[PDB]
Each structure stands twice: as structure tokens, then as C-alpha cells.
């Protein structure tokens, strides 16, 4: 059934699983037409498919051409997501295929279930967690590869950089969701925190800066402060 606070440690056991987040698949800018009506212009998007144990991120990049001449794009986006994820599972060797796929939004359950009928033994699950994966396009290197794509493409990342050399996947996932929660609540502030010190850099093969353990604790404190702040600024407390 659904994934929640009570069964949180299952994310880090040794059964292969993937999160799928579809919130950045269909992206638009809304603008006025010469006649003063409103229209949308699609921009490139991405499916965010993440192994929470290993950090392996399968970024399937959704080029605007896939929407040409289609109707009801928000509904099509869920099915295209399910179509791309099922193609990815087929692409992977049997022993790498997931035993569960957790979708971050319940409207992905039926599209994915239907695309995965060939895999009766892969559990398709919702979650009650409010995860912040929509903020993946606030990671500069991910946003850049999405916006530069001229055709469909799947780029592979480790969203944990080398953190697992020093910390467990539970701690790595907690750090990731704190960073992304901060970027979602106040992107400018969050990015200022991450980059204010020019001496700590992002390796070419990494997404986040090369913080020492001590520096991560400071960073993590700063991100909690930010989220608490915004929560007051927002609610006046």
C-alpha cells in the first residue's frame, strides 16, 4: 500500500525500488497573445526517477516536440511518464529491475499500473509523504541539461554525489530532501547558502559542493533555519 512515516526505513532496505515524480514533465509559460487572450508555450521537462538507496537518478528529458499536435496535455503527461518509466524498466537487466515503484502523485497510479501490466510482480505504490522532488529543476546542472536538450534523451546522475562513501543512504536521503525542501521554499536564499563560500566548489562530476562533514552540519542547520523562517514570514509567527 501507501508509503508513509511509519514505513520510512523500507526505502533503504535491499529491495530495489524507484521513486517516480512527474511534476516537471509538462512545463509551460503562460503569456498574452496579440489579441489579449492567454496562451501557453511549453518548455522542456523531465521525469525524475530516483533510486533512494543508491542515489542513481534516471533523468528522462521530455522535449517540447512530444506535445506537438496533442490534446489534453496534462493528462497525456501522466501517460507519457508511465510509458517512459516502463521503457526504462524493460531496458534494465532482470536483476536490476525494481520490485516496487513509488509514485509521488496518486494520479500516476493508474497510468503506471496499466503500462506495467507485463510486470505483475512490480508493486506500484503511492505515498503520503510530501516530497520535494519538484525542486529538482533548482539544481543548476539538472536544469541546464533539460533546457539545452534538442531531442528526447535520458541522462544518468548520482544525486548524492560521493556522500555514500561517508554516510548511510538514510542520512543521504534526509540531506537531499532537506536541500530540496529549502530550494522549493526559497530558491534564492537556499542557493545563496549553498554557494556563499567561493572556496568550496562543485566538482565537474558532481551536483552539490564539496563540503566537509563539519561544513555539511553547518549547511544543514542553515537550511533548517531558512525553512523555519519562511514558515514564519509566510504565516506571521
Amino acid at each position: 500500500g501507501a508509503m508513509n512515516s511509519s514505513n520510512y526505513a523500507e526505502l533503504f532496505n535491499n529491495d530495489i525500488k524507484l521513486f517516480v515524480d512527474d511534476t516537471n514533465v509538462y512545463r509551460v509559460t503562460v503569456h498574452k497573445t496579440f489579441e489579449g487572450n492567454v496562451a501557453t508555450k511549453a518548455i522542456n521537462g523531465c521525469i525524475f526517477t530516483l533510486n533512494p538507496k543508491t542515489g542513481h537518478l534516471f533523468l528522462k528529458i521530455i522535449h517540447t516536440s512530444v506535445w506537438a499536435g496533442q490534446k489534453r496535455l496534462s493528462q497525456l503527461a501522466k501517460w507519457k511518464t508511465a510509458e517512459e518509466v516502463s521503457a526504462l524498466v524493460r531496458s534494465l537487466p532482470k536483476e536490476e529491475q525494481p520490485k516496487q515503484i513509488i509514485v509521488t502523485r496518486k494520479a500516476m497510479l493508474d497510468p503506471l499500473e496499466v503500462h506495467m501490466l507485463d510486470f505483475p510482480n512490480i508493486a506500484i505504490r503511492p505515498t503520503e509523504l510530501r516530497l520535494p522532488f519538484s525542486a529538482a529543476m533548482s539544481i543548476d546542472k539538472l536544469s541546464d541539461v533539460v533546457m539545452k536538450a534538442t531531442e528526447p534523451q535520458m541522462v544518468l546522475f548520482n544525486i548524492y554525489d560521493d556522500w555514500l562513501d561517508r554516510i548511510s543512504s538514510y542520512t543521504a536521503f534526509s540531506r537531499l530532501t532537506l536541500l530540496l525542501r529549502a530550494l522549493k521554499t526559497n530558491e534564492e536564499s537556499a542557493k545563496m547558502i549553498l554557494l556563499s563560500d567561493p572556496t568550496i566548489t562543485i566538482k565537474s562530476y558532481h551536483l552539490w559542493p564539496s563540503f566537509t562533514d563539519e561544513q555539511w552540519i553547518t549547511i544543514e542547520s542553515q537550511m533548517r533555519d531558512l525553512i523555519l523562517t519562511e514558515y514564519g514570514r509566510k504565516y506571521n509567527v
Partner: protein, 300 residues
């Protein structure tokens, strides 16, 4: 006109015959039902006074044999049986009539209710859903599960309705996943109508039989089957015009006949609201939508 005699009525029971019924008393001198219209299937059904648990009954067609009821004190129920001695049968029936020991099937002449509920129902198809080939009539009761329910336990005592499952490889063509799930016409017309049922008459007959088992026995799996067969049509953008017209009539008479007090347990809110208001056929069931809105507007 045909007759189903009773040997006796040793236990107090409410006896149904089609949409009619009446409470009979323990050892009250009851010897059956006469004047039963030829040309239709019929169902004779029972609810004991001392245990309103287990409604049960028999589907039959008088053209296929001489049938009677006899209480079995070991198995504790009224059993249908076939009398093969035709002379012996006519003699018994004539004596019981002479002694006016039979109630009369009380068909009002204006009334096409039973015809309209059983228009497409055929004994030969009932006997394939309810497997027991040594008898020409078919036993059904409240508790019998369907083959699909058994998948999700005694197979000899199951209702073998045609399995409908909207999230199944049979329903969904590889490569048309979204198309086939949002518009079920392929599954209705190619898979079910052309492939399994052969024609819409057989489809409507199974649907009508499932409704009647849901209504007369409270058979839950039959209710599930009735709604699935409605929903498959309503969820198809492409349905022959004659099938939509006939479905509207079929459903109209089903809703008309349903006991007002059972509408809470025999009608699935989600399916009906979807079918009348969101589906491809939301505007195609005028008679059914009018009677539903005037009779069960709470459900909607």
C-alpha cells in the same frame, strides 16, 4: 400456461416467483404455482421464515421439462426436481388444480415487466454460467461467489460470469495503453462483443441475469458483474446505436423494479454517477437518467 407443483410446504417460507412473492405457513396446504407464462425464463425463490439468511432459488424454462418443488428435510431446503413421467405429472397437476390447491401466476395484461427484465436471458446461457449439467434448471443463492471473486472457493458452486477487468492485458492493447484505458471501445467491441459474446444479445442476457441474481438473492458478485457490464459500455466512445438504445430500456426497467429500500446496497454510486454524468454515453441514456434522477436523486 405452465405449472410448478409442490409436494407440500413443511416449513414456513416466503416464496418468490419472478417479481412476485408471498409468506407461506408451516404445513399450510400449498401445492404450487399455475398459469406460468410460456416463452420466458422464470425464477422460483425462497427465504425461510426462521433463517432469513440464504435466499436461494431455481432458474427454469417450462418448455424444457416438467419441474416440481419438494422440501428435503435432510438438506433443509425446497428442491427443484424434474418429473420424467409426463402422464404422472399431468395427472398430479390436474388434481391439484381441481382441488384449487395452487396460486396463480398473477400477470396483469398491461404489464411487460418480466419480459423487459428477461428479454435477452436464455436458459442455455444460464446453464453455462451456473454449471450443473445433470439438471435442466439452475440453482443460485446469496452466498455463491463468481469465478472472478475466486481469483481475488469451491469451483463447482461458482457463478462463471465473463471476467471483465479494466486493468488487464485483455483490456489493454500494447502500445495503446492510454487510448484503450480512457476509451474502452476496443475491449467492448472487438474483445467482448466479437470475441467472447459473439453478439450484443448474449452480452445483454448476461447483464440482465447478473442484475436479477443481485436483486433476488442479494448476490454481491452478481451486482459487481452487472455494474462492470454497464460501465464497459458507458466507458466506450464507440457503441452501436441500437445497443445504446436497448441498454437505456434495459436499465430503465431494472431501476424501475428495484426495491426502493435496497437502492443503498444494490447501486454503486461511483459507476452510476460516472455513467450518467461523465462518461462517453452521459447523454445517451435518457430514460434511465430520468428515472434515476426522480427515484434515487440522493445517490446522485
Amino acid at each position: 400456461m405452465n405449472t410448478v407443483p409442490f409436494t407440500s410446504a413443511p416449513i414456513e417460507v416466503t416464496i418468490g416467483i419472478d417479481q412476485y412473492s408471498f409468506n407461506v405457513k408451516e404445513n399450510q396446504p400449498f401445492h404450487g404455482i399455475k398459469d406460468i407464462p410460456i416463452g420466458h425464463v422464470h425464477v422460483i425463490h425462497f427465504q425461510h421464515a426462521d433463517n432469513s439468511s440464504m435466499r436461494y432459488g431455481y432458474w427454469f424454462d417450462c418448455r424444457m421439462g416438467n419441474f416440481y418443488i419438494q422440501y428435503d428435510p435432510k438438506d433443509g431446503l425446497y428442491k427443484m426436481m424434474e418429473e420424467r413421467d409426463g402422464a404422472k405429472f399431468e395427472n398430479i397437476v390436474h388434481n391439484f388444480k381441481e382441488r384449487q390447491m395452487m396460486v396463480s401466476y398473477p400477470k396483469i395484461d398491461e404489464d411487460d415487466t418480466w419480459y423487459n427484465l428477461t428479454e435477452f436471458v436464455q436458459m442455455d446461457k444460464i446453464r453455462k454460467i451456473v454449471r450443473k449439467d445433470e439438471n435442466q434448471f439452475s440453482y443460485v443463492d446469496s452466498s455463491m461467489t463468481t469465478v472472478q471473486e475466486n481469483e481475488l472457493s469451491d469451483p463447482a458452486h461458482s457463478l462463471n460470469y465473463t471476467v471483465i477487468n479494466f486493468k488487464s492485458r485483455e483490456a489493454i492493447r500494447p502500445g495503446h495503453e492510454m487510448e484503450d484505458f480512457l476509451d474502452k471501445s476496443y475491449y467492448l467491441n472487438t474483445v467482448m462483443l466479437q470475441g467472447i459474446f459473439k453478439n450484443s444479445s448474449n452480452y445483454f442476457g448476461e447483464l440482465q441475469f447478473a442484475f436479477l441474481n443481485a436483486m433476488f438473492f442479494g448476490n454481491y458478485g452478481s451486482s459487481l458483474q452487472w455494474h462492470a457490464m454497464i460501465e464497459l459500455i458507458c466507458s466506450s466512445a464507440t457503441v452501436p446505436k441500437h445497443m445504446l438504445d436497448k441498454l437505456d430500456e434495459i436499465l430503465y426497467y431494472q431501476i424501475k423494479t428495484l426495491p426502493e429500500q435496497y437502492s443503498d446496497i444494490l447501486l454503486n454510486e461511483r459507476v452510476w454517477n460516472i455513467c450518467l454524468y461523465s462518461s462517453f454515453q452521459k447523454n445517451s441514456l435518457h430514460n434511465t437518467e430520468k428515472i434515476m434522477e426522480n427515484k434515487y436523486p440522493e445517490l446522485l
